[PDB]
């Protein structure tokens, strides 16, 4: 963290950066309807609710 | 005289069918038939109010790109068929909900829609879908709105629950307009003319009401010239 | 990113007199690159003077 | 054969009709070849190219 | 369909495989946007055969160029069908003709 | 200019024998335009213009 | 820009002089000698050059005066 | 609302001269620029009431192709000069007869016309002809009527020569429709009318009367 970021954290104490948002997003200038979702899970990994 | 003109009047309305009419305006002086005909055609073809289907909710359907058991058409084709529904909504309401429940084999048409009496279906023979099984059933909730012009679903300003399907709305009831200027037999003069406007619509709008609405729009837009000043 | 109206007014004021360079391949001579004053249009296609 | 087909459908044998300018209502000075053409939408869309 | 054509549209539509073509003749027992069930004629049964033909239609499947592959029924219940008849139209097909 | 432009300039400047409004005397280009817009004279009418 | 190239003579020299003047009006605090008319610094500089107010010698003289002060 | 339409908000009238003007109205709904401009153009060119020279008598001249000694201009050019004669006739008169008599050498102009006080010549400096010989005199009996539009001599077909009747004061009208936007609606129309009259009427007044005629033609329907 740059020193100014340290001062900003000292003033407002919020700090939640354990994980980074690397998510799938609709590409820009694309509007549509989700018609199918498929989930592939490796053999030996917990299957989520979906 | 020279400075005073003869104002046209609505002399005849001929209703060939429910979706076809001829309207005759007489008398018209030289050149005024073509001027009024073109102005009225451009206003009628562009700026006539109407009512159109905007939202459809079908039970058990999440989006248009799907099928329903016992129905031969896809949901996309059903929405396309609903785009051709001719609905007249009573004045004072810009929004209405109608329902369509039908079970059993047969063509599901517009005459099977349940409406509250403020809605008139002009084409009850319009086919919406086909049910191909005795166990098949369909239950839609259709939303009809008043408007003007063409408002696609994308252009609508942006919660919407999943299942509600947006339909592109063509509000204008006028489909085709033609006009002719023929000779008029008035008193003794021969310079007068007669304007005949042929209107092919979807049956929702009356001919006389259409003519008066176009004339009102033209007069309101001409007021700015009649009061020319720097604004 | 939210595409507010004031952003569109700012864009008009930015491009008011800012020339922009148009190029078509192959650039066989220097007239293959020319500068124009842009006029903002609704659509996705460039409008070229005949 | 084309002219016979046009005559059966009560259409001019030259395939040219009298068109009017929708902006003014004035007839174009010459007959215009009006008919029906099979047109295609090629997979070269400005959405994928801008 | 094209109003003006050459006559080869049916050949392309049938030999491309996009359409659903009746393997055996008979009477369409059931029609739906996703399934066609044909009751086969008595002359064309393999001895000891169920006697029905089932055609499951492709509905809104992505193609190699991100286009839509969709098959739409063009038959009614109770309609007689012979061998080689088009039961469903694939993309760019209209009643068995290339559109 | 090329194509339609040329064609238009070609069509407007051609000469026709015994067109409507032949032999008329015109005060200038403005009255020629007025005669054209009033269907008094055709575009290809041979006239005398000041 | 025919008037500007007539007043300067060379297009490249005109570009350089107009760039200096536009930088003076944008980065520096110098004010325009003509009505701005909601125009960008480049167009203002071109108009000033066309009017004969801005030349290379004039810019050098004003720079010398600023250095003296 | 379905009956609510955009009305012009910026109307700019620029006066190049006393007989030339440019009127810009913005914004208009899509397509209304062409509708209004075309309707106004037809009304102003072919239906606007006015007063104009129609018929002439020249002493010693029988046919329009005849020759007169002493006048540089031919008869047809004299008739052409009489067409561009801006004239006002007092209301209640549909027909007047003015006379032009001049002997000498030089330009015979419109200010040498004597009338009965019910006729006003807007352009006294208009040149009618040119006398070349001092022994030559010109005597003309000009008829001025009230009509509508632009009626040529051929449409109206003794010694009377017929003049093309330019009843309408409008000498030129052109209209252009440009793009205009309010908020993010970039499909609106802007109407620009470049207008030129003969001098009898100001362009703004002519636009007002044309719009009044068009509006009164729709009275039975609104």
Swiss-Prot record, chain A:
It comes from the Bacteria. The RNAP catalytic core consists of 2 alpha, 1 beta, 1 beta' and 1 omega subunit. When a sigma factor is associated with the core the holoenzyme is formed, which can initiate transcription. Belongs to the RNA polymerase beta chain family. DNA-dependent RNA polymerase catalyzes the transcription of DNA into RNA using the four ribonucleoside triphosphates as substrates. This is DNA-directed RNA polymerase subunit beta. It comes from Vibrio cholerae serotype O1 (strain ATCC 39541 / Classical Ogawa 395 / O395). The lineage of its organism: Bacteria, Pseudomonadati, Pseudomonadota, Gammaproteobacteria, Vibrionales. The gene is rpoB. The chain holds residues 895 to 944 of 1341 of the full protein.
Curated annotation (Swiss-Prot), chain F:
Coiled coil: none annotated. Belongs to the RNA polymerase beta' chain family. DNA-dependent RNA polymerase catalyzes the transcription of DNA into RNA using the four ribonucleoside triphosphates as substrates. The RNAP catalytic core consists of 2 alpha, 1 beta, 1 beta' and 1 omega subunit. When a sigma factor is associated with the core the holoenzyme is formed, which can initiate transcription. This is DNA-directed RNA polymerase subunit beta'. It comes from Vibrio cholerae serotype O1 (strain ATCC 39541 / Classical Ogawa 395 / O395). The chain holds residues 502 to 551 of 1401 of the full protein.
Swiss-Prot record, chain G:
It catalyses: RNA(n) + a ribonucleoside 5'-triphosphate = RNA(n+1) + diphosphate. Its EC number is 2.7.7.6. Keywords: DNA-directed RNA polymerase, Nucleotidyltransferase, Transcription, Transferase. One of its GO terms (biological process) is DNA-templated transcription. GO terms for molecular function: DNA binding; DNA-directed RNA polymerase activity. GO terms for cellular component: DNA-directed RNA polymerase complex. Belongs to the RNA polymerase subunit omega family. The RNAP catalytic core consists of 2 alpha, 1 beta, 1 beta' and 1 omega subunit. When a sigma factor is associated with the core the holoenzyme is formed, which can initiate transcription. Promotes RNA polymerase assembly. Latches the N- and C-terminal regions of the beta' subunit thereby facilitating its interaction with the beta and alpha subunits. This is DNA-directed RNA polymerase subunit omega. It comes from Vibrio cholerae serotype O1 (strain ATCC 39541 / Classical Ogawa 395 / O395). The gene is rpoZ. The chain holds residues 6 to 74 of 90 of the full protein.
From Swiss-Prot, chain H:
GO terms for cellular component: cytoplasm; DNA-directed RNA polymerase complex. Homodimer. The RNAP catalytic core consists of 2 alpha, 1 beta, 1 beta' and 1 omega subunit. When a sigma factor is associated with the core the holoenzyme is formed, which can initiate transcription. Keywords: DNA-directed RNA polymerase, Nucleotidyltransferase, Transcription, Transferase. DNA-dependent RNA polymerase catalyzes the transcription of DNA into RNA using the four ribonucleoside triphosphates as substrates. GO terms for molecular function: DNA binding; DNA-directed RNA polymerase activity; protein dimerization activity. One of its GO terms (biological process) is DNA-templated transcription. This is DNA-directed RNA polymerase subunit alpha. It is an enzyme of class 2 (transferase). It comes from Vibrio cholerae serotype O1 (strain ATCC 39541 / Classical Ogawa 395 / O395). Belongs to the RNA polymerase alpha chain family. It comes from the Bacteria. The chain holds residues 4 to 233 of 330 of the full protein. The gene is rpoA. It catalyses: RNA(n) + a ribonucleoside 5'-triphosphate = RNA(n+1) + diphosphate. The N-terminal domain is essential for RNAP assembly and basal transcription, whereas the C-terminal domain is involved in interaction with transcriptional regulators and with upstream promoter elements. Its EC number is 2.7.7.6. Residues 1-222 are annotated as: Alpha N-terminal domain (alpha-NTD).
């Amino acid at each position: 963290l740059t020193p100014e970021e340290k001062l900003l954290r000292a003033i407002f104490g919020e700090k939640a950066s354990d994980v980074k948002d690397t998510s799938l997003r609709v590409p820009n200038s694309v509007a549509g309807t989700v018609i199918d979702v498929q989930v592939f899970t490796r053999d030996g990994v917990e299957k989520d609710k979906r | 005289s020279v400075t005073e003109f003869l104002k046209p009047r609505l002399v005849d309305i001929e209703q060939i069918s429910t979706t076809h009419a001829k309207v005759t305006l007489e008398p018209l002086e030289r050149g005024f038939g073509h001027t009024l005909g073109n102005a009225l055609r451009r206003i009628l073809l562009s700026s006539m109010p109407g009512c159109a289907v905007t939202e459809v909710e079908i039970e058990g359907v999440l989006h248009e790109y799907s099928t329903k058991e016992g129905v031969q058409e896809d949901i996309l084709e059903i929405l396309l068929n609903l785009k051709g529904l001719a609905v007249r909504v009573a004045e004072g309401k810009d929004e209405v909900f109608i329902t369509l429940n039908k079970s059993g084999s047969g063509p599901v048409v517009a005459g099977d829609i349940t409406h509250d009496g403020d809605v008139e279906i002009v084409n009850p023979e319009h086919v919406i879908c086909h049910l191909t099984s005795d166990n098949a059933a369909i239950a839609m909730r259709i939303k009809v709105e008043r408007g003007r012009g063409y408002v696609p679903a994308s252009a609508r300003i942006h919660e919407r629950p999943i299942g509600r399907l947006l339909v592109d709305a063509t509000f204008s009831p006028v489909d085709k307009i033609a006009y002719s200027v023929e000779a008029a037999r008035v008193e003794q003069r021969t310079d007068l003319d007669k304007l005949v406007i042929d209107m092919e619509t979807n049956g929702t709008l009356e001919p006389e009401e259409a003519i008066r609405r176009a004339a009102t729009i033209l007069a309101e837009q001409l007021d700015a010239f009649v009061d020319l000043r720097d604004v | 990113e939210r595409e507010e109206a004031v952003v569109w007014d700012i864009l008009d004021e930015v491009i008011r007199e800012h020339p922009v360079l148009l190029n078509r391949a192959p650039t066989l001579h220097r007239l293959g690159i020319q500068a124009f004053e842009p006029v903002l249009i609704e659509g996705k296609a460039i409008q070229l003077h005949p | 054969s084309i002219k016979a087909m046009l005559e059966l459908a009560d259409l001019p044998a030259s395939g040219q009709l009298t068109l009017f300018d929708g902006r003014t209502g004035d007839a174009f000075e010459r007959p215009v070849t009006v008919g029906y053409m099979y047109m295609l939408k090629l997979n070269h869309l400005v959405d994928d190219k801008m | 369909k094209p109003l003006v054509g050459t006559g080869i549209e049916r050949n392309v539509a049938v030999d491309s495989g996009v359409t659903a073509v009746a393997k055996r003749g008979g009477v369409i027992q059931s029609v739906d946007a996703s399934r066609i069930v044909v009751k086969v004629n008595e002359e064309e049964l393999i001895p000891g055969e169920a006697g029905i033909d089932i055609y499951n239609l492709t509905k809104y499947t992505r193609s190699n160029q991100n286009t839509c592959i969709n098959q739409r029924p063009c038959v009614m219940p109770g309609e007689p069908v012979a061998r080689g008849d088009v039961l469903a139209d694939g993309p760019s097909t209209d009643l068995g003709e290339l559109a | 200019p090329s194509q339609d432009v040329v064609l238009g300039l070609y069509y407007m400047t051609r000469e026709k024998i015994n067109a409507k409004g032949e032999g008329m005397y015109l005060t200038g280009p403005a009255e020629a335009e007025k005669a054209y817009r009033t269907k008094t004279a055709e575009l290809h009418a041979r006239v005398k213009v000041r | 820009v025919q008037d500007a190239v007539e007043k300067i003579g060379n297009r490249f020299d005109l570009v350089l002089v107009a760039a200096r003047r536009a930088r003076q009006m944008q980065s520096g605090g110098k004010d325009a000698l003509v009505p701005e008319e909601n125009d960008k610094p480049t167009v203002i500089a071109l108009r000033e050059i066309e009017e004969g107010l801005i030349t290379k010698d004039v810019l050098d003289a004003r720079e010398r005066q600023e250095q003296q002060e």
